[PDB]
Design a protein around this ligand. Structure first.
Ligand SMILES: O=C(O)c1ccc2c(c1)nc(Nc1cccc(Cl)c1)c1ccncc12
Length: 331
């Protein structure tokens, strides 16, 4: 009978109501600067499809970041650029400063705003209960903004959240997997990073939406409040669902599969087994208790749901009691 269709509960038709130039990124004309305006200082890291460098803009001595793209479809480069241009100036969204090309190799590169980041592997262990609430609220500002702008990030994870802790400044980076939400579209499920993949990706339910990012956020929150990084530690995409099922239980998983008429891959039948929904208190211990509260657990419970439609939206999440003290302090 095929899967049951799904629509986002919020910002459903935002792209339909915009001119085609907004979302038809393949038609976007890119104007490439000369990479000679930037002098590379050092390599910061290598990605799946990019090499990132710290650089200096020789014209004004500003420190920037240059993301040299490895060859990918021109379609995909135009998508990242168009999304970054559409989101530019939005709350906690990384700023695309320039688009250049090396004169010799012709390799395209994206120039970004520099953030003085403290890596999550060093930062998260130092965060107070207030800090987690504060930064979660900052991520929510970025997500509600991009979702309102008709964009799903599709790769929310600690590496993609650059935090200048000294200045309490946060930027959501790496828009390379981001996509425009169009109601009825069947998207690629080979997105996000394993540990942050929502159950919709794991069961191959393609008609997903912005709510995908809310699952990923919930994975981040659970790792922060429980000091268990990553929270769901699967060995592969199949075992990832098993790890989730051992916490959220199998009853709701099978109800989700039923509701959407999802044809489940036959290997899941043997590996999923039967598991009760675990109480969040089972993850609380002497070393993380100070980060856990009834508000944190209620909020986490409302993000970590199989049914993507039942998760809090970024706007609903911002209104949660977990953030009452942050919201008070920001006024
Ligand atoms: O991709 C983007 O959108 C993107 C955008 C901005 C930054 C970035 C990636 N990666 C950075 N650093 C980084 C750190 C570790 C490994 C790698 Cl590969 C990169 C970085 C640092 C400071 N300011 C901005 C950025």
């Amino acid at each position: 009978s095929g899967p049951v269709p799904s629509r986002a509960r919020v910002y459903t038709d935002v792209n339909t109501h915009r001119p085609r130039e907004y979302w038809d990124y393949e038609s976007h004309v890119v104007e490439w600067g000369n990479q000679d305006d930037y002098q590379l200082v050092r390599k910061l890291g290598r990605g799946k499809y990019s090499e990132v460098f710290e650089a200096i803009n020789i014209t004004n001595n500003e420190k920037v970041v240059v993301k040299i793209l490895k060859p990918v479809k021109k379609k995909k480069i135009k998508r990242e650029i168009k999304i970054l241009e559409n989101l530019r100036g939005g709350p906690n969204i990384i700023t695309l400063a320039d688009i250049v090309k090396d004169p010799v190799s012709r390799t395209p590169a994206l120039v970004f705003e520099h953030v003085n980041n403290t890596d999550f592997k060093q930062l998260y262990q130092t965060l107070t209960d207030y800090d987690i609430r504060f930064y979660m609220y900052e991520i929510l500002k970025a997500l509600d903004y991009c979702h309102s702008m008709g964009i799903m990030h599709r790769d929310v994870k600690p590496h993609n959240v650059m935090i200048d802790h000294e200045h309490r400044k946060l930027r959501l980076i790496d828009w390379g997997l981001a996509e425009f939400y169009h109601p009825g579209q069947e998207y690629n499920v080979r997105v996000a990073s394993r540990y942050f993949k929502g159950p919709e990706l794991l069961v191959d339910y393609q008609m997903y939406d912005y709510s995908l990012d809310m699952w990923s956020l919930g994975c981040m929150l659970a790792s922060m409040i429980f000091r268990k990084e990553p929270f769901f530690h699967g060995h592969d995409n199949y075992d990832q669902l098993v790890r989730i099922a051992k916490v959220l239980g199998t009853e709701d998983l099978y109800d989700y599969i039923d509701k959407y008429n999802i044809e489940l891959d036959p290997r899941f039948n043997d590996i999923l087994g039967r598991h009760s929904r675990k109480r969040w208190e089972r993850f609380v211990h002497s070393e993380n208790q100070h980060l856990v509260s009834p508000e944190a657990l209620d909020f986490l419970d409302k993000l970590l749901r199989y049914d993507h439609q039942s998760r809090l939206t970024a706007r609903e999440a911002m209104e949660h009691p977990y953030f009452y003290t942050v919201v008070k302090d920001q006024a």
